[PDB]
Amino acid sequence: DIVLTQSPATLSLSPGERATLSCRASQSVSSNYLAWYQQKPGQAPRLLIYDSSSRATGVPARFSGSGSGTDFTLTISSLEPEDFAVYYCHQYSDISPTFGQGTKVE
Amino acid sequence: VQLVESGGGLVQPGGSLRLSCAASGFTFRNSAMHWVRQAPGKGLEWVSSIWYSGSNTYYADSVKGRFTISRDNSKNTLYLQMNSLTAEDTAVYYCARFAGGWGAYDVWGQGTLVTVSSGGGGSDIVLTQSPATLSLSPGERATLSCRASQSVSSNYLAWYQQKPGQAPRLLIYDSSSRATGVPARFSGSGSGTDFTLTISSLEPEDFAVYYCHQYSDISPTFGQGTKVE
Amino acid sequence: VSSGGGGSDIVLTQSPATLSLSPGERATLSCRASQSVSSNYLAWYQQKPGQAPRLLIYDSSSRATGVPARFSGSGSGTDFTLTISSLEPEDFAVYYCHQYSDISPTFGQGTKVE
Amino acid sequence: VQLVESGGGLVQPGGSLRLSCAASGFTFRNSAMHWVRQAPGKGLEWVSSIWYSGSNTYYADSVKGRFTISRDNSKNTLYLQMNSLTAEDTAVYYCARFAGGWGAYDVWGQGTLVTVSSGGGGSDIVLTQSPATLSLSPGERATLSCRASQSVSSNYLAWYQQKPGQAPRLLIYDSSSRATGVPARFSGSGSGTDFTLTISSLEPEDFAVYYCHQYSDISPTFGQGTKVE
Amino acid sequence: VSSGGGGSDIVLTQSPATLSLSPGERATLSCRASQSVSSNYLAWYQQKPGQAPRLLIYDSSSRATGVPARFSGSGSGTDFTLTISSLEPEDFAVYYCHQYSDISPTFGQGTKVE
Amino acid sequence: VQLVESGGGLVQPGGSLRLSCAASGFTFRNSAMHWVRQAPGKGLEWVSSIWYSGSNTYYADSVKGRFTISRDNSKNTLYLQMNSLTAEDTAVYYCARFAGGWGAYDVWGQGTLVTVSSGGGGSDIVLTQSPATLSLSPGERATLSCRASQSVSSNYLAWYQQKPGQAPRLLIYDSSSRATGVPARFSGSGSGTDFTLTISSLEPEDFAVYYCHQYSDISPTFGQGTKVE
Amino acid sequence: VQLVESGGGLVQPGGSLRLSCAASGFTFRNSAMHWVRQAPGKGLEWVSSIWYSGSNTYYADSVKGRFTISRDNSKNTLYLQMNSLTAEDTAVYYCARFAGGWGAYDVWGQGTLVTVSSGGGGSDIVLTQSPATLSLSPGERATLSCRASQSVSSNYLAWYQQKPGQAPRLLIYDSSSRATGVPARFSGSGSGTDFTLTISSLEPEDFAVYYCHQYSDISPTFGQGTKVE
Amino acid sequence: VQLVESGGGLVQPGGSLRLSCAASGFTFRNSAMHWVRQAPGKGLEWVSSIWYSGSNTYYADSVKGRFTISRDNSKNTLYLQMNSLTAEDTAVYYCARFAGGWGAYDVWGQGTLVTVSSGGGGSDIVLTQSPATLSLSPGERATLSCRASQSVSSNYLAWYQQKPGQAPRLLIYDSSSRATGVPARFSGSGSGTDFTLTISSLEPEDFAVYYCHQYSDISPTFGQGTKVE
Amino acid sequence: VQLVESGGGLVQPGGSLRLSCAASGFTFRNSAMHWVRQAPGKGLEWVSSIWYSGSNTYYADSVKGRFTISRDNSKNTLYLQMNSLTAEDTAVYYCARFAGGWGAYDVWGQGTLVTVSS
């Protein structure tokens, strides 16, 4: 059962700075079937990245996903106030989908 | 009941300046007179005091040995002689009458700005590190940011590690060059005004304060540090 | 570089660092000393941008001459309070507390009322 | 490429001060050098200009006759001699190299504050009149208010009428006393900090500017005026 | 008391006096001259509180060395514009226009971008 | 080319209303017709769309299940049936012809005001808490203020503590009575229009939002809260 | 002494819902019972009240004609029937026992969330106009910016001018085409996500509020407007 | 103590509308009830009154014969039946309780807007004449301006002279064509939105009011007149 | 392309509740639909999944034997029947379309809070 561990748990940054988020799996993620979601207070999660590196429709270029195997990273090039939220990674390579515990960017 | 201050201005480091404060409306010859200063964007800070003949004159550790408070009671005038000035003396200086239990600092001069600087225009390259703190576990990745207010020519930017009680240790120079004996898990990147230090998989010995440093001009500056705990 | 002893000046801590209020509202400012302030020799000053500090309260509760009655101080020992009962538009400034009970005068770091 | 300023400070009205600006990094002997000042919370204002051998110095109308710009090319230094100073000269003064079509003011000094004051912070009683303007018709009543920041001792407050091009006339003194020759339709009242001038039935000759005036201390002050049109 | 004014000085009027914007948005600043500015000798400066002005644009359209490309000037004669394409948090400051086409240099009164 | 509107007015919550829009000067039967509304002081907001037979009709999310757009091409008339009206539906409603790439909303009706209200005031007792936010450390004292627009009879004023995700908890009632189980560090005081809650020594569990509450009449009102963080 | 709440959940606009509250530990039939709600992120707001056999029941103005409070004393149960639900009703609802002078709201239910929504989003194109306010003189140029969160296909963007009390007026469509009768001093430009409206020489009749509008999909959206004053 | 108003909206000229006002909190059967209206941007204007059934209902001359005030004391409701509506009836209508010596209009409804109009979202062509007044002597030149809010098609603009107590007389039509019998000293010019009437040498018989008039559409409008004195 | 969710609320322990998710803008009959929940202050947690006829429906161990996922393709509606509720089932529940390699959870319902308490 693939465990996803995100780090750091909390990132305190200012507008204009870059946020680098890490998702590390206990096993290799087949086909790089890993996704990133953004969730703001009181709202449903919203897809940012899928297939490790594919940017969803409508997602600004400032969001970028990379990595493979067991090490994945989400990078936000220039943080805006609407980017401060909690971010979850998600692997869908097997029959037991699992999520990271989230990284809150504040 | 007034204090008319004069003096101040812009002076080079190591220079001298004399402040004066002319009193009227009270028995100046008997009054305790103090100097108080206020650095730009900071709070009030006591500087010196002088009183009757028979009492001690007092100075703050910041100025004792360089500043001299004095008074000429025949002209109802208070003086502050400022010698061997340093950039840390930059502040607005106030003369004030001290009334103790009868009013504390009840009369203030209007204040005069003393700026101690050899600089020009004129802006040193400011380095801002982000985030201020990173809490991580062994094995995880640490990504540190250093952004400069101006372009760092030739990418002359270095990264140092400092553990408590020890001298800084060179990790990266020329933005991307790993120093001899530094493990390959340390790597730097970036150019111009955007630089990054990455520690790929943290070890328990990597928890320390990390500083970036630009040496592309005659005025070297450091970032304020990122603590990885 | 120091002339003092193992000794420790009386440290004044003001709270909160900032207060955002409207005209007519109450402003309550706190000053907290690390040691007891002998004789309650604690003063409060008002400072507006670009101007010299102005005495509001001395001896913890004594209102300076010309200060409106809406300003009032209280407390003793290590716990002091400055109260502005109903803020006026001329009251928005930085406020400092100040202890003069010993040889080493010290100030609080200020509370901004905006 | 640097301009190192020095001088400035706090001086009393009518005093004198000299500012200096030491240049480095360029051929100072070829450069046109200007002084620019900025009053607190105001915009930039050109002060003076100087150029090469054929000395062709220029001044702003505010300072012509009081300020003298000069230069010593052997010390690469620009000077500004400031005489007959007034509170209107209070500003941060910048030296600047003028490059014209090749950079305008491309190099600036850091600026030094010059404050011209005799100790003015304000114990004076401030009088506020309201409203600033009143549009009324003949036969109507005009009610004018004067408010003091502090209590006016002994109710030493007066009211004056001023028509364009003429000296003021005493209307009311001691808050309520009608001056000799003033028609009964004028009347004053109030005490402490709240005063009123009432014109019971306006006449066509009553349309003018009205000032209140407190003389209860040694710093006399006037209201800023109410125009009755 | 006057020295002969006045006068022939080219009057520069900046508009608006204030612009309230967010990071990422466009700032468009206007400078209007009372008379034609010969050779388009018009400059733009940025000034942050407590600091000396910084040259941004000269000769109406020339971006000074080290100024980011998001700053751009345009216009001619009596109508000039400074454009900040996408505001950064360090771009919030007061901006002045300046004409140096004659012996009496004049400045606009500034536009504050907050 | 004109759109002539009719209908609207003032109705109570839960009521129903029908708007009309008669067209002339164009081929109405083929036109895409929309409704757009604008709350007082707010911007324009699209509401509904209708077009040719064989197309879909669209509604804004907020009005779906409440509003019905329709048309009668024989009478060149557009309709909007408005049901389940609430205060959020108060707006000026416009009918407009949608031209797409040939003019967007190129023709507008003059608009009719729809107001949904069960009353006109307003005269409730308004409680104003201050300050909105208090950043304090453990061990410090929090002084919270609650000011009423009118006198609170019998001093029937309560204070509540609410933590995130939990129901409010009674702290003080009758202005000064501590509820059973509330620690002695909390204390209420005041009367008439001026009430205060004082937390003498903040514990970590004391950081929450605090509301005042007057229950002196048939229209209970709360303050908007003070967050002690 | 407890109140056990039940009901709530997610419904669509125009829907209905009933909340329940079962009491225990006190003589319920003698207690006044209230409903209080708290919208997400906002404060507490009273909703309704009910009391003894001669039920004189009260409602907040917003819910009058939509909500009904009732009680079944044989079951010790409080009810709140909620009809004509809209998005402004989204809140956490609490039942509470009202003790008046002996405890105010001394007993609370744990609260149930009621959310009124016809769909998750909300995934529309967001138009952001800049700046919100422009203070300009006649003859000056107004440059208005409209930024889109996504690319506006076909550059289907329009601008409207609205004066107080009047319907909007089309100025520009297809990003840059002037509507018939619009003077040449108005001009639109831009593509993709960045659009501007420029009024070259402001006339006195040009001071109004200007809106941008994208019509490139089935969810038309507007900017919140720029006021040119 | 409340009056809940309802009704109003946008209606055609000659149409009908009924306003209602439901009272609570007082003995409605004994109270005198009035209607008051307020035209857009105007002051308050009394409309009608009703009292006990032993007194007479009263109406203003503006509405007498078309409006009917009535009451149903069993429902605590006040009514205003508005028949034969005209654009002059456009106003916000308030119901109000009249207390005479015990409170005048102490309770008001919130008001509902009644707009009586047959037009679309476009405005008629507005003509603005300037100056409002010209004081001249015989032999001098009078230059009068007429500016239109929209372009006047075909230059269909006319000028009229009106002397006191007499019908207007045609001076100029088609902007520049001098009417039969008009002296050559009258001449008109201009096109589009800018028109001028010039009287080359004033005679004493030329002192009158002058109106411009556009007839380029189905909605004829006049300027507000320029008086030549 | 949206999912309109409904249902939820406050229920006693051991009670029952049915959640609904109405789809539009895509071929719902062919889509894999999941339920995901998030207890207050915690992270996302997969609950259940349903797909085409001929595939297996799946449940997390925490709901297996108590929850039933189902669909009505004629009405384009997804259901979650929640029985034998416990305090640990308290969470905001989301319906979501699963696109796998073509976008993972690319469409989400807005979520509804289910609280189980007495």
Numbering used by the authors:
A (entry chain O): 1 to 106
B (entry chain I), D (entry chain F), F (entry chain C), G (entry chain D), H (entry chain L): 1 to 229
C (entry chain J), E (entry chain E): 116 to 229
I (entry chain P): 1 to 118
Quoted from the paper:
Diabodies are among the smallest of these bispecific antibodies. They are constructed by connecting heavy-chain variable fragments (VH) and light-chain variable fragments (VL) with short “GGGGS” peptide linkers. Therefore, the two VH-linker-VL chains associate to form a dimer with two antigen binding sites, each consisting of the VH and VL fragments from the different chains. In order to investigate the structural flexibility of the Fv interfaces of diabodies, we have determined the crystal structures of 10 mono- and bi-specific diabodies with and without bound antigens.
